[PDB]
C-alpha cells in the first residue's frame with residue numbers, strides 16, 4: 082500500500098487488465114475447459130473463459146487487485162516502469178490463432194507477439210520473486226481461512242501439502258506460476274514497459290544461524306595426556322570445508338575463547354589459510370572437503386609443523402615451521418575448534 | 419539530567435535522502451573522469467604540438483600543462499592502478515570476495531583511458547619529453563587492469579570502437595614496420611617507426627595478450643574483424659620472427675615474447691588449420707562465405723597465412739634439428755622464437771586436446787597427445803644441453819620458463835623413464851655457471 086499508482090501505471094494497468102482477461106480465456110481454451118456461467122471442473126465450464134463481465138465480479142476484482150499488488154511489488158523490489166516506444170504502444174498485433182486456440186466467445190486472446198521480445202537473467206530473478214510472492218499470498222489466505230500443512234490432503238482437517246515455503250514447493254505449482262509469469266512479463270515487455278530490476282549488492286551473509294551464544298565448539302584431549310618432550314603426530318579429517326582450527330593447545334585453554342586468539346593454543350585455520358597464535362597471519366593453503374591435516378610437533382627442538390594431504394604447509398616466507406620457538410611450559414595437547 | 423527527566427535527545431537533522439546507489443558520486447568514478455579529462459586535454463595539447471612543431475612556436479604555451487601531466491598524472495595512474503588492480507579486475511567472479519567490485523561504467527572508463535593512452539603514445543616517443551618509459555608503464559599496468567568480458571557484454575559502442583581501433587592501429591603500424599624492414603634493409607621516419615615498435619608497441623601487445631590469455635577473456639574480446647586484425651598481427655609477428663636481419667636479431671627477444679603471448683592468447687588454432695572446421699570460434703565458421711567476401715579473407719583456413727606452416731611440419735623440423743644437433747650461433751631465430759610460441763600454443767590447446775575431453779570426439783580443436791608434449795620437451799631439452807657447450811645464452815632461462823607449463827601438464831611418471839636419463843645427461847653438462855632448474 083506504500084506504493085502510489087501513477088497515471089501512466091494506471092493506463093498500462095488498463096491494458097494489463099485486457100491482458101489478464103485474454104490470459105484467462107486463452108488458458109481455459111488451451112487446457113480444454115469450455116465456457117460456462119459457473120466455474121465447475123466436472124462440468125468443464127469457466128466464466129473465466131467467458132467474458133469478464135459475465136465472470137463473477139468478486140473474481141474480477143480479486144484478479145484486478147492481484148495485478149495491482151503485482152505491479153506495486155515490482156516497483157517496491159526495485160523495477161522502474163517506463164515507456165520505451167510510443168510506436169510500440171500504438172501498434173497492437175494479434176498472434177495467429179488456430180481453431181483449437183480460438184475461444185468460444187469473440188474476444189480473441191492476443192495482446193501482442195510475445196515471442197518477439199527476449200529474456201533477461203534479472204527478469205528471471207524478478208519473475209521468481211513474483212512467483213514466490215504469489216505463493217506466499219495464497220498461503221497467507223489459506224492461513225486466515227485456517228488451512229495448515231499436512232502430508233496428505235483433507236478438506237475436513239484443512240491440511241494441504243502445498244502450504245510450504247516456495248523452496249520446497251512442488252514442481253507442478255512452481256511451473257504454473259512460472260508460465261503464468263512468463264506470459265505476463267513477456268506481454269509487458271512487448272508493450273515496451275521493461276522492468277529494470279536493481280543491481281545485486283555484494284555482501285557476506287556469514288551463515289551465522291547457530292542457536293544461542295555458542296559459535297564454535299572446542300574438542301581437546303585430557304590434560305593428563307600432555308606431552309612434555311618428544312615427537313608427536315595426529316591427524317584431523319575435515320568432512321566439510323569451513324571454519325575449523327586444528328593444532329596443539331596448552332592445558333590452560335579456555336573453551337569460550339577462540340583458538341589461537343591468545344597464548345593458550347597454537348592453531349591452523351584452513352578456511353582463511355592462516356595460522357593462529359596471539360593473532361593470525363597467512364600460512365599454508367585452504368583445504369577442501371575430505372582433506373586430512375597432520376599436526377606434527379617437536380618439543381625437543383620447539384618446532385611445530387602441519388600438513389595438508391601429505392604436503393608440508395608453507396608460510397608466505399620460505400620457513401617450513403608453523404611456529405619457530407615456544408617455551409615448553411606444561412606440555413601441549415591435541416585440540417580442534 | 420536530560421536522561422533522568424526523560425527528555426530523549428536525537429540528531430539535529432534527520433537525513434532527508436541517501437544518494438548511495440548512484441555510482442557517479444563515487445570517488446573512483448570522479449577520479450577516473452578526472453584522469454580521462456586531463457588525458458584528453460593533453461591529447462589536444464599534443465595535437466597543437468603537432469601543428470606547431472614544424473612552426474615557429476615550438477615552446478609550449480601549455481608548458482605548465484604538459485610538465486604537470488608528465489610529472490604527476492602518469493605516475494599517479496601507475497601507482498593507483500598497481501595498488502588497486504583487484505578492484506577493477508573483479509568482474510562478479512569473486513576475486514577479493516570481501517568487497518570492491520568495480521562498476522561496469524568505471525570499467526568502461528578504464529578501457530577508454532587505455533585506448534586514449536594508446537592513441538597518445540602512438541608515434542609520439544620523440545614528442546614525449548623522456549616520459550616515454552612512464553607512458554609505456556602506464557599502458558602496461560592499465561592493460562593488466564583491463565577487464566574485457568564486462569565491457570564486451572555491457573559497454574558503450576564508442577568504447578568498442580576505441581579498443582578495436584587501437585588494436586587495428588597497432589596491427590597496421592606493425593605491418594608497416596614489417597614491410598619497410600623487408601623493402602629496406604637500411605636502419606628517418608622508418609627508424610622512428612621501428613623505435614616506436616621495439617620500445618612501446620611490442621611491450622603493450624605482449625602485456626595485453628598475456629593478461630587476456632591468462633584471464634581467458636580473449637574469447638569475447640576478439641571475435642569479429644578484431645579476429646582478422648589479430649590475424650594480421652600474427653602474420654607480421656611470424657614473418658618478423660622468421661625474418662633475416664641484424665636489427666630483427668637484436669630484437670629476437672621482444673618479438674619472441676610477443677609471439678609466445680599471442681600463441682597463448684589467440685583463440686583459433688592457427689597451427690592446425692585443417693581441424694578448425696568444427697571449432698565455432700573460427701572467424702571463417704562464424705562469418706560464412708558472404709561475410710568472408712565482405713571482409714578481406716582468402717576463404718581458405720589453410721591459406722589464411724602462408725608463412726606459418728603446418729604444426730606437424732614444425733614438429734618434424736624441431737625433431738630433425740634436435741637429431742642433427744645445431745648450434746645457437748649458427749641458427750638462432752627459430753630457437754629463440756618458434757619454441758616459445760610452440761609451448762604457449764601447447765599449453766593453451768591442451769584443454770581442447772582429446773586427453774581432457776575424450777568425449778565429444780573429433781570436435782577437439784587440436785589432436786594434442788601426451789607423447790606429443792613429451793617429444794616436444796625431449797627436443798627442447800636436447801637442443802638446450804647441446805647448445806650448453808656452445809656458450810649458450812639467457813634463452814636458456816627464457817626457454818626454461820616457456821617450457822615449464824609443458825612440464826606441468828606432462829605426467830610425472832610419463833615424464834620419467836626419459837626424465838632421469840635426460841636429467842643426468844644434463845648433469846654431466848650441468849657444470850656451468852648457470853643452472854637450469
Ligand SMILES: Nc1ncnc2c1ncn2[C@@H]1O[C@H](COP(=O)(O)OP(=O)(O)OP(=O)(O)O)[C@@H](O)[C@H]1O
Nearest residue numbers: 114122127219223228236239240241243244254257
Ligand atoms: N481452473 C483452475 N483449477 C484449479 N486451480 C486453479 C484454477 N485456476 C486457478 N487456480 C489456482 O491454482 C492453485 C491450485 O489450487 P490448490 O489446490 O493448490 O489451492 P486452493 O484450491 O486455492 O486451496 P486449498 O489449499 O484449499 O486446496 C490455486 O491457487 C488456485 O486458485
